[PDB]
Amino acid sequence: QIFGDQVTEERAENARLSAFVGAIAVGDLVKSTLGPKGMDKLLQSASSNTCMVTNDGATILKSIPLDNPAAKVLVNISKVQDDEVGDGTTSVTVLSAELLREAEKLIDQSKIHPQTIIEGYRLASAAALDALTKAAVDNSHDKTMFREDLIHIAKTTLSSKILSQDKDHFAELATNAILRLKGSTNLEHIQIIKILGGKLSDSFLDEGFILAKKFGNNQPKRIENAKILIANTTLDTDKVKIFGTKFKVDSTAKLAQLEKAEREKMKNKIAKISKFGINTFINRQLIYDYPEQLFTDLGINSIEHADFEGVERLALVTGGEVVSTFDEPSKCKLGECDVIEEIMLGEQPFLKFSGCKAGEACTIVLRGATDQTLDEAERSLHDALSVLSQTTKETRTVLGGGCAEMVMSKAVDTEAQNIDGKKSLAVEAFARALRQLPTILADNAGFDSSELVSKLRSSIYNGISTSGLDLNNGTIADMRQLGIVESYKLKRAVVSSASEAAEVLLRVDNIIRARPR
């Protein structure tokens, strides 16, 4: 009898496999996408009319449905990586799968209880993390070399994306955008503007924090010494926020009297707003010709339909306030900047700012063939800016190209020298999983992954722990001369997240699904 009413259970006899197989199958979704030479997958809905190609790990993992709850566990964890860190998502998914893959062997052939595998993985993780710290090198002094590190960080994260062809240009755009801040890691101070027409190599960085929505029918195109006041209020009529009210009339003349009364309200309302001492007025709502002219006569720009992005972007660079209440003047915060211009970029109007209060903010302007190329370029810069922002606070870096991974596996194998018996096998499994990442990199690049990784093993073991994979020539190279470096914190995140992800699945021995509702 046991479970019924559409309940499904997998007992330990089979769940002991599903707990591994599910999450391992997730690795198969992105293992081919790792590295600058990764391969693409197609995604297609049942309609057949949504066919797309991508190598973006997060897109693939989220787009593909999973039938195994154990598989869904890893994807949910990988999502957190994508949201909290912004990079390493594929590496966590691949490494997590390989940690469980080898752990499955520790169940299958070695008959090691999951508790011992978990404890061994914890000890091996400590060894791997210690290796990253010892191999971590900063250039906190001589900011000239620090900037150079940022450029290499920018190219490394930008690689494998649509911008990888033009990374020599966009690395400097991303680097300058973060170097300008030398401070807060809040990415809201850097915007990306997506314009059709031209090549991506033509992208510019403009400190003017360009906004993409024009205001006004006939207003001054340039204001100096501007005070900025944002609003969410109706300036078109009275009866504000009253719904369903009608005016019963026996003539259109009486209806006109209502409109005249509305103008009486608008004249008083604009006057009270002008007493704030402003030069530009931004309203989330529409501003009809009447309140626009009333502002225009006072020398005040009238910006209408400032939606969520409009208010949040403009308020940030100007340092203003949405100000929902205008009952009394000078009872709110006003923004400030030196100049506001109407500017044509690609025969499209934009708002250009200069001299903003704490005007460390900037934008990078994209010039793309089509929407797909702009959207991919936008996300590509976003990922690089996130990692670069983290390297502003954390100045230590580690060597990439598989170097950090091989160095970690060296420490992990060293840890197994002095450890309990069955735990030794767990630690060795951890090291073997670490060496799979540079194997995937060499494999996707079309090289002899066995020769390249095996040579790397000998290189890193017998001193000179600076070497790594040259994924362009298919050989072993010095990563510092090649210029392949990765954020210390980012690499730590990959090890930490993958280790926890394995433990989560290792602790599973049963799947129970309640009756659908």
Binding site: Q1, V7, G244, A261, D509, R517
Partner: protein, 528 residues
Amino acid sequence: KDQGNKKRQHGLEAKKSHILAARSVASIIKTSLGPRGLDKILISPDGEITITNDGATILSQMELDNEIAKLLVQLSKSQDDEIGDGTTGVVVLASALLDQALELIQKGIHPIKIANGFDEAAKLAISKLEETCDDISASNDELFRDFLLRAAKTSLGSKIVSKDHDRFAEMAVEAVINVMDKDRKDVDFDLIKMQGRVGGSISDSKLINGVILDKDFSHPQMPKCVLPKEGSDGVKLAILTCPFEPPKPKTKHKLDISSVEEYQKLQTYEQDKFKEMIDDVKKAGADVVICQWGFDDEANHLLLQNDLPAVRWVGGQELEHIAISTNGRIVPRFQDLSKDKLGTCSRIYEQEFGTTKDRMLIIEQSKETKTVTCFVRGSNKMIVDEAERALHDSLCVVRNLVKDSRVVYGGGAAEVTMSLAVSEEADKQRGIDQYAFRGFAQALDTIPMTLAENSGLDPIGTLSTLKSKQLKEKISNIGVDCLGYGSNDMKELFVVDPFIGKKQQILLATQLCRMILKIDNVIISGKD
């Protein structure tokens, strides 16, 4: 009606089926017994995937048709209502007793003889739990509190909380202290409210001597606290179900406005009413108004200008929680307010939690209270859930330790003592009963063996060591090396269980075994 399409079992075959079914279902949670147990994936009716080892959640998630297995679920409910610490143990033990019953039935021992044998054998086991117990509160307040913290810290060490168990141990113990008197020693867990929110990490969790509303006093320019009013009786608040506004229509206004004049009159009527309400609330002696519903824009304008903070969108139960904390009453109208129903508290303020921007509104008592809030943080939903459950388990332990000072060491230690005691006495039965008494002891062994196996230990090598130490030299607190130590001493490892816990675990598990064995005929109809 509809005699057909029914199932029926009876007799010897029913007895084998009933036990084997109980084994199959009971075996599901074997791996949940122990601080090193394993998790399970539970998928909700809506397709949400969660991971937990909570015995109560797993048994509740299991929706099965086997009526005998359903009895095992009822057992766990009893253990949860009384003690809380035996959810899995009573099912594992009861299953072991049923497994012994199977062999006993096969050998020719009548189910009644089995039930009576197990019952008398249980009396021996319970006797040993009392004779070998110790007292914690028999020292003094400083050590008593320390021991309560140590018991919590041990229980938290199997949870995600372990990263900062020192903070959560204090939350559990202090939460109990704040709602109990030293002389009465009555602890009611219903006086401790559990709360949490996804974000940050578990290290930001805090015990609040009051209630959390998480509100901004209804305007960003409103003062971030309510003033003590020059030495008044703390801060007085109003609890309203009607919002601090004239009632509004439930659909549309449809109020004819012929010109700006009538519009301004409508605004004026509201503003005049808002002032009238402000005067009445202040004359009641109220400093802040908390309403079930939100406030209008004009409401926030008049409340701000006249320095009368108000709290918006506080739900029905939350309003009662304010009253319970502040010894107030929920008043349906602003015009019914008076000093005798306004709530009293030490202070009302926004509390910052590190860099967290929520800056939650707290109403604090700063004294003995009718409610505390245990606020849990965490980096994910299941982390907050597990951490919140971790406090529940700790509160169950601390509550039990305060009510009954007698404690035993149950981490496989008491089980071996009781097994040896029953085994030695079994030889004295001089009759048929010896079959059930020896079986009972073997059933008890299932627990320290399960604890060993779930930890990666040989359950047979482990149990032999435990019995040898307690038998060859002297009976002591020698248990299973689940957490990891250099020996089996549960005092140096600090694994302590309440006496009333182990007592009820065996008694209820025995009753369940007898309940199933007492059933000789099961008839199952359809589902209409």
